[PDB]
């Protein structure tokens, strides 16, 4: 059969360099293993390589050894074409449902295998897509069920790098889809960022933005340092789990989770990632929170400048925007449930194995009502997704949500 891949960075902006850095590295890794470019679909906004802030124009690196991963990466879905609708259409393999981009899709055969890697921001039940778009977990599950029902592949492996990424599959990912999944974190942890300005191991001094993400570089640097005809999917999961746990210090690391068909863990990794003919034959990392890396970048910029006050006022606006969202959400909880019960309700985490939300259509509706009244969530606002899900689960009506949002905003 034929090995296919879909690589997605869900973010843009130079502050988010790392997510397209991850995706570009994954592309070069798969090419080195003998996957063909026509079978690898790359979603990247593509604003990094030639960004005015990039100290190495035309180059993207993904770890402090500084090897370029940008050259040769195809422009399949870039800019405005990096959408959930295009991602869903690529996975289904129906070129007629794609809007824009190259038209490359996963029009795979029943004997083929597929490898999907996503890297950016997220929250409970949701994944980010560039310019304020949100991808809801259940729609992603639905695409996998549809693809499976059309006999489009033999097996699939999915790696997801994002905050709270366990919540995209817990209680909803079927095990009969020949799909195996791992996530950087459990349903409630955040995801961690590595190779940042000011940490060890040191990125090259000219960089003001972080180079990679902990779970992502963990699996990629593990793959490229091993013979993939011998390493199993399970061995990579084990190695990635230990490295991402960062010496089992969950204040500085997270729990890598697995979902779906665990029988796939017995398979050799080359069936999914190819094999590199040259591969024949640790310290605690200083990491930062995915949600904190943006401000660390603006602060790196502030400290290195002389317009110095323009950056500061932009830091002020960013924090103030976050405070507005955090407060609006907290106040909605107060108006709906009272003080002393609003935060318990909004912030309670369901037991592992249960779905985040019982009505996914309600979740989208609460987000819609919120944003109509309180403004756009942004990428940062996905941190409030569990709060909206908990409003849904509480049986509070959409009519009462409307009233609370109008009072709050």
Ligand X SMILES: *[C@@H]1O[C@H](CO)[C@@H](O)[C@H](O)[C@H]1NC(C)=O
Q: Per the structure block, which two tokens stand in for 116?
A: 């999907």
Backbone angles phi, psi at 156, to 5 degrees: -140, 145
Helical ranges in 225-381 per DSSP H: 233-245, 270-273, 293-303, 308-337, 342-347, 360-374
Under rule CB under 8 A, residue 340 binds a copy of itself: yes
Under rule CB under 6 A, residue 376 binds ligand X: no
Distance (Å, rounded) from C-alpha 3 to C-alpha 18? 25
For the bound state, the minimum distance from the C-beta of residue 200 to a copy of itself, rounded and expressed in Å, comes to: 15
Q: Which of 36, 175, 284, 304 binds ligand X (CB under 6 A)?
A: 175
Helical ranges in 33-170 per DSSP H: 84-92, 137-149
Distance (Å, rounded) from C-alpha 88 to C-alpha 94? 9
Question: Which of the following is catalytic: 121, 210, 392, 405?
Answer: 121
For the bound state, the minimum distance from the C-beta of residue 261 to ligand X, rounded and expressed in Å, comes to: 5
Give 224 or 286: the residue with its C-beta nearer to a copy of itself. 286
Give 326 or 402: the residue with its C-beta nearer to a copy of itself. 326
299 binds, among a copy of itself, ligand X, none (CB under 5 to 8 A by kind): a copy of itself
Under rule CB under 6 A, residue 99 binds ligand X: no
How far does CA 84 lie from the centroid of its chain? Answer: 13
- Least Cα distance to 172 among 135, 142, 133, 128 occurs for 142
Under rule CB under 8 A, residue 331 binds a copy of itself: yes
Question: Which of the following is catalytic: 19, 24, 25, 163?
Answer: 163
Under rule CB under 6 A, residue 161 binds ligand X: no
For the bound state, the minimum distance from the C-beta of residue 179 to ligand X, rounded and expressed in Å, comes to: 10
Please choose, out of 187-195, 274-282, 321-329, 374-382, the segment that lies near a copy of itself by the rule CB under 8 A: 321-329
Under rule CB under 6 A, residue 261 binds ligand X: yes
Q: Which of 339, 344, 347, 397 binds a copy of itself (CB under 8 A)?
A: 339
Which residues lie below 8 Å from residue 17, measured CB to CB, with a gap of 6+?
Answer: 48, 60, 209, 210, 211
In 10 A of CB 139, how many CB atoms?
A: 16
Q: Tell me how far CA of residue 157 lies from CA of 113, 307, 374, in angstroms.
A: 8, 46, 38
Burial 364-399 (b: 16+ CB within 10 A, else e): bbbbebbbebbeebbbbbbbbbbbbbbbbbeebeee
Under rule CB under 8 A, residue 138 binds a copy of itself: no
Q: What is the DSSP letter of 52?
A: T
19 carries an active-site annotation: no
Under rule CB under 8 A, residue 408 binds a copy of itself: yes
316 binds, among a copy of itself, ligand X, none (CB under 5 to 8 A by kind): a copy of itself
163 carries an active-site annotation: yes
Give 166 or 212: the residue with its C-beta nearer to ligand X. 166
310 binds, among ligand X, a copy of itself, none (CB under 5 to 8 A by kind): none
Under rule CB under 8 A, residue 200 binds a copy of itself: no
Give 76 or 155: the residue with its C-beta nearer to ligand X. 155
Asked whether the beta carbons of 9 and 44 are under 8 A apart, the reply is: yes
288 binds, among a copy of itself, ligand X, none (CB under 5 to 8 A by kind): a copy of itself
Of 274-313, binders to a copy of itself (CB under 8 A) are 288, 292, 295-296, 299, 303, 312-313
Whose CB is nearest to ligand X?
263
**Vertex 96 angle, CA 108 and 79, to 5°:** 95
Asked whether the beta carbons of 119 and 19 are under 8 A apart, the reply is: yes
Backbone angles phi, psi at 132, to 5 degrees: 55, 30
Q: Count CA atoms closer than 13 A to 7's CA, side-chain side.
A: 29
Q: Which residues of this chain interact with a copy of itself, rule CB under 8 A?
A: 288, 292, 295-296, 299, 303, 312-313, 315-316, 319-320, 323, 326-327, 330-331, 334-335, 338-340, 407-408
Catalytic residues: 121, 163
Q: Which residues of this chain interact with ligand X, rule CB under 6 A?
A: 175, 261-263
């Amino acid at each position: 059969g034929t090995r296919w891949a879909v690589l997605v960075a869900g973010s843009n902006g130079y502050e988010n360099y790392r997510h397209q850095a991850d995706v570009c590295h994954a592309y070069q890794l798969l090419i080195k293993g003998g996957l063909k470019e026509e079978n690898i679909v790359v979603f990247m906004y593509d604003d990094i390589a030639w960004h005015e802030l990039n100290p190495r124009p035309g180059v993207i690196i993904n770890n402090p050894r500084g090897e370029d991963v940008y050259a040769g990466v195809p422009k399949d879905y870039t800019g405005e074409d990096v959408t959930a609708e295009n991602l869903f259409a690529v996975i289904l393999g129906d070129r007629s449902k794609v809007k824009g981009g190259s038209g490359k899709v996963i029009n795979s055969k029943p004997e083929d295998r597929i490898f999907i890697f996503y890297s950016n921001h997220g929250g409970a039940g949701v994944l980010g897509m560039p310019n304020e778009q949100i991808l809801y977990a259940m729609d992603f599950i639905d695409v996998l069920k549809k693809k499976h029902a059309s006999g489009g592949y033999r097996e699939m492996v999915i790696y997801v790098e994002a905050c709270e990424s366990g919540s995209l599959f817990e209680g909803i990912m079927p095990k009969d889809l020949n799909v195996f999944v791992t996530t950087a974190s459990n349903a409630q942890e955040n995801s961690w960022v590595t190779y940042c300005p000011g940490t060890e191991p040191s990125p090259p001094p000219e960089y003001t933005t972080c180079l990679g993400d902990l779970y992502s570089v963990a699996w990629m640097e593990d793959s490229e340092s091993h013979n993939l005809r011998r390493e199993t999917v399970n061995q990579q999961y084990r190695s990635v789990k230990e490295r991402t746990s960062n010496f089992k210090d969950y204040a500085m690391g997270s729990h890598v989770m697995q979902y779906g068909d665990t029988n796939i863990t017995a398979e050799k990794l080359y069936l999914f990632q190819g094999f590199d003919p040259a591969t024949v034959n640790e310290a605690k990392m200083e990491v930062v929170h995915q949600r904190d890396a943006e401000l660390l970048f603006m602060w790196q910029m502030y400290q290195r400048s002389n317009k110095k006050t323009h950056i500061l006022k932009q830091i002020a606006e960013t924090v103030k925007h976050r405070n507005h969202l955090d407060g609006s959400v907290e106040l909605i909880g107060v108006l709906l449930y009272g003080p002393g019960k609003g935060s318990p309700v909004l912030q309670s985490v369901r037991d592992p194995g249960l779905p985040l939300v019982d009505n996914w259509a309600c979740l989208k509706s609460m987000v819609r009502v919120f944003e109509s009244h309180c403004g756009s969530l942004t990428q940062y606002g996905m941190k409030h997704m569990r709060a909206f899900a908990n409003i849904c689960n509480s049986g509070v009506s959409e009519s009462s949500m409307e009233e609370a949002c109008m009072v709050a905003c």
